[PDB]
Amino acid sequence: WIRPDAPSRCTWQLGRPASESPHHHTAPAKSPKILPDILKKIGDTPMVRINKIGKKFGLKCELLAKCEFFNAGGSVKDRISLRMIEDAERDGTLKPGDTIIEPTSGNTGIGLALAAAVRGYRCIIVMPEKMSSEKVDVLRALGAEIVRTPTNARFDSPESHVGVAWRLKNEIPNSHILDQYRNASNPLAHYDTTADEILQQCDGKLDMLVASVGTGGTITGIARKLKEKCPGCRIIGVDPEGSILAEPEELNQTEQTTYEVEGIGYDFIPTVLDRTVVDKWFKSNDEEAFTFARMLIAQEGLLCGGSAGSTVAVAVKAAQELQEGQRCVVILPDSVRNYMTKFLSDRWMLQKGFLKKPWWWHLRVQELGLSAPLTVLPTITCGHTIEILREKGFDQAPVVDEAGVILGMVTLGNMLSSLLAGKVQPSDQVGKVIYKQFKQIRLTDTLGRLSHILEMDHFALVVHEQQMVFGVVTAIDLLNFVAAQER
Amino acid sequence: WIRPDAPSRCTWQLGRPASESPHHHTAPAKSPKILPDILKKIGDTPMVRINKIGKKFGLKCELLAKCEFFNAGGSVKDRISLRMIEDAERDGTLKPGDTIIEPTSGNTGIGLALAAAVRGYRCIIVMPEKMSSEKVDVLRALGAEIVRTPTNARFDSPESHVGVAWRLKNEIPNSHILDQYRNASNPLAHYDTTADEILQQCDGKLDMLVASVGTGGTITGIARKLKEKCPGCRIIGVDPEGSILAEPEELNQTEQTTYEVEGIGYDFIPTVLDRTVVDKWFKSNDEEAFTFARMLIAQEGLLCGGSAGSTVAVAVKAAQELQEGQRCVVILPDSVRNYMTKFLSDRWMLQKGFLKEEDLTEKKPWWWHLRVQELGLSAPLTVLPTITCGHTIEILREKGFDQAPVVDEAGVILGMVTLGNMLSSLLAGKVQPSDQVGKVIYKQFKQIRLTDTLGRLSHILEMDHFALVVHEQMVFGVVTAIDLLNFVAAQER
Ligand code: HEM
Ligand code: HEM
Ligand SMILES: *Cc1c(COP(=O)(O)O)cnc(C)c1O
Ligand SMILES: *Cc1c(COP(=O)(O)O)cnc(C)c1O
Ligand code: NA
Ligand code: NA
């Protein structure tokens, strides 16, 4: 076994010329008009000015986001996945149809699974239990095999994601662990490409770089290059509370060692992380990470993930010293796709304790002044439905059976349109026209609750615990109320 | 009210010089090094060669995918959202802080909500009930207000997405419906940009273009440009069963008018759709759409949506008429993000009948239907929750076990402890020998029955490390992925 935290034997030093590098460096390769496969859509990610969040928190400098979620697999890790595989192929390590096994928090796994799918490798991913089910869904669809490990397993225990990866490799002939924690291809991808894109996009002018840290390849690769090209650029590392990557060590004094944000922080120092090139660390927490991720979406239209939020949360503190004319770049590592049922969900945010209202929000449904609806039996014909709605002056009716079970809604307009198009005959029962989907809501529920319900259903049927329908309410009724009140 | 199917008053005809257009026309532009905002990340999408799928279905031509899911909002509609807003701003129609209301199947709503978030407009989306909750979650996060309409509401009834959009607008001052069904800004975005990109990318050489159809903006804009610049190019339109877009009308004969694929097909002919520039239509269905979308992911690594699947399902038939050296381009409209809990989920697919246990078990390994009991389980040592960390080390070592379920006096399973994690914890000073195991115990696990299959175990092991075998409450066994691997390897030796 080779431990993921063994001290690095890299003899790189700032001031040492590139000639002396024992490593293979891949230069930018002119992209053809037609990409031979999706793996060429990795790199050259956009750099986008942040327009509202910096100003809101009193930054004077320019704040720019390097948006790594536009890579083919949706994350920054697509760069290292591709580079680790290509170098291993060049080395003769990785032969056609071999098996790739990787311990990952998710994104390196997705990157590797995507390349494996394209290139024809068997791919086995080992991922802690805390990681999102959205990651599992994409991994499965890409044909990866998936093993999970307890989130709280110490990294050197047999059941850690690293321990289990090495134990699987030992049982599977022609398997390899490319090993993002030790493989130079990880930070070198960022040194050769990500860093050169940033310089190019900024015309070599950059005062601060803020990056969250997991393996440390991103911050290490970018920093080694920037210290060479742009030594005035301050390097700011972001580490979650619970992790021990940050220096000085006094920053890491808490009991808690778990957190909800995914992809950053560890219980060991990865070999590829060079902490000497980080000028200053900040600790982040889950609440600010998710607050800022939601802000990035809502104010900048940037559909990014949790650690992107961590990074920007730090950047608005760290770049406060910068002046107008100066420039801070942040790395946004992955996409909102990984977190659809996590921080993107208000219910989740509430459950986890991580979370303004219009004037009408706390009012109750009954204050709408509901009209008691006409109801019809499910045995009514399409023709008699038209006749009774028009005769009684209603445009719709709940269909309710003899036992009082609400079966759905019919409307005058849809019944007429269906008749006139020959979809139903006047003597048909209403089965082919009835709207079956609706949501019940109480007389005593809030209009806020109604508003939420109306994001999923057209019709809310008003009921009460104490068999009767008190009203049918749609979004137009709620608007009419709100508008009338304020006119 | 203006019906979204009124006959087009456009007098374009194939052969009329571009100098006769009365429209505003843009073109693809080089983008700046630093984007001023994310709305610049729209257009110039990749054209990617499809390497496995074409060959597998016998195609001789080159098959290329235009991947619109790389746009800022995740779809092709980001092009028309931006264009409709920019034109309405230049017009003087849309003023600072006005309200945008749009009837949408979801992607145009997302596009407009994204632009509205950036530029500061109130945005109200009106979306049929069938559209995914993933769309709702993105819309919500972008600050859009969301209203829904019955999926099988006829377009001309008051409760359709188009009818409800009109009724909302009438009650909200300073609101506008940009109206993708009638607004020239929709097909023009594709005529001016999408089509020109496709031609630049193909060096002006292609033989067939296959596109699925909803508003008709994509196919109409592309086809009008291609018919002018590449008149050999065959235009193939894809329409779901249940929709009336396709011609001849005989193709549209069907029992149902509902389907699960999102973003294509309608019960009316949108004003922006020019069907005269479509050479041939193919009817698609849900099963092939989702089969092909999953195949695009699994074989090409293209993280696309349902209608992308519809399009490729048709392309592998339509392009059979092409020979080696010809080229077919397909439009892939949106991303897998919208369908995470729909076609991406095997449970949803099974529930819907688009996946049948038969070919779900054809691809299955020999061990798949063996039972957990056939692993030959060892009775595990269990320990009480009052055991100390020190005594856990001792009893595991003494009795020869690497792990033990923690089980209270009443038989409740509290979790697992392991020798390795207990020792690492002790050596690192996280616990002391006399501590109880609360801080080291793994509380997460999944129960499985002796009579469950190894296929079921395999699924379980994609979510949990430990499966604890129980029966109707003694523990029969503890199983992990490594145990399953060892068993399969031993039987295959
Ligand atoms: C003048 C430039 C450089 C020199 C002279 C240098 C030198 C070395 C040497 C001697 C090794 C040890 C090989 C071995 O133990 O088998 C090594 C490993 C490594 N280098 Fe470099 N290196 C340079 C640049 C870089 C850069 C730019 C990066 C990353 C951005 C990097 C990352 C690594 C990593 C991750 C390893 C593996 C560490 C280990 O196994 O302990 N190096 N380097
Ligand atoms: C090249 C010569 C073209 C001419 C002479 C032409 C002409 C016209 C005219 C005169 C109208 C106004 C209808 C009215 O309100 O009276 C119109 C509307 C329109 N045009 Fe064009 N057009 C051209 C190209 C295009 C192209 C390339 C597209 C789409 C790619 C397009 C799509 C439309 C649409 C969607 C409308 C709105 C239709 C309506 O409201 O009924 N046109 N066009
Ligand atoms: C990997 C990752 C990071 C950190 O990048 P390293 O190069 O591993 O330090 C941050 N966020 C997410 C979501 C990641 O996957
Ligand atoms: C809009 C859309 C289509 C059809 O494009 P049109 O330009 O409206 O014909 C196909 N698929 C998806 C997912 C869409 O959003
Ligand atoms: Na993590
Ligand atoms: Na649809």
Residue numbers in the entry:
A (entry chain B): 43 to 397, 405 to 515, 518 to 538
B (entry chain A): 43 to 514, 528 to 548
Question: What does the literature reporting this entry say, word for word?
Answer:
Importantly, hCBS-FLΔ516–525 crystallized, and its structure in the AdoMet-free, heme-, and PLP-bound form was determined to 2.0 Å resolution. The S2 face is also where a number of inter-subunit contacts between regulatory and catalytic domains are found. Specifically, CBS-1 and CBS-2 make a number of hydrogen bonds with the active site loops 191–203 and 170–175, respectively. These contacts are likely to be important in the regulatory the ability of the domain to modulate the activity of the catalytic domain. The structure of an engineered version of full-length hCBS dimer, also determined at a higher resolution in this study, provides a structural interpretation for the lower basal activity of hCBS; the regulatory domains are not interacting at the dimer interface, as found in dmCBS, but are crossed over to contact the catalytic domain of its opposing subunit within the dimer, thereby sterically hindering the active site entrance. Inspection of our hCBS-FLΔ516–525 structure suggests that the Leu substitution on Ser466 may lose its three hydrogen bonds with residues in the active site loop.
Its canonical role is the condensation of serine and l-homocysteine (Hcy) to form cystathionine, which can be further metabolized to cysteine or glutathione. In mammals, the activity of CBS catalytic domain is increased up to 5-fold by the binding of S-adenosyl-l-methionine (AdoMet) to the regulatory domain, an ∼140-amino acid stretch harboring a tandem module (CBS-1, CBS-2, collectively known as the Bateman motif) found in a number of proteins.
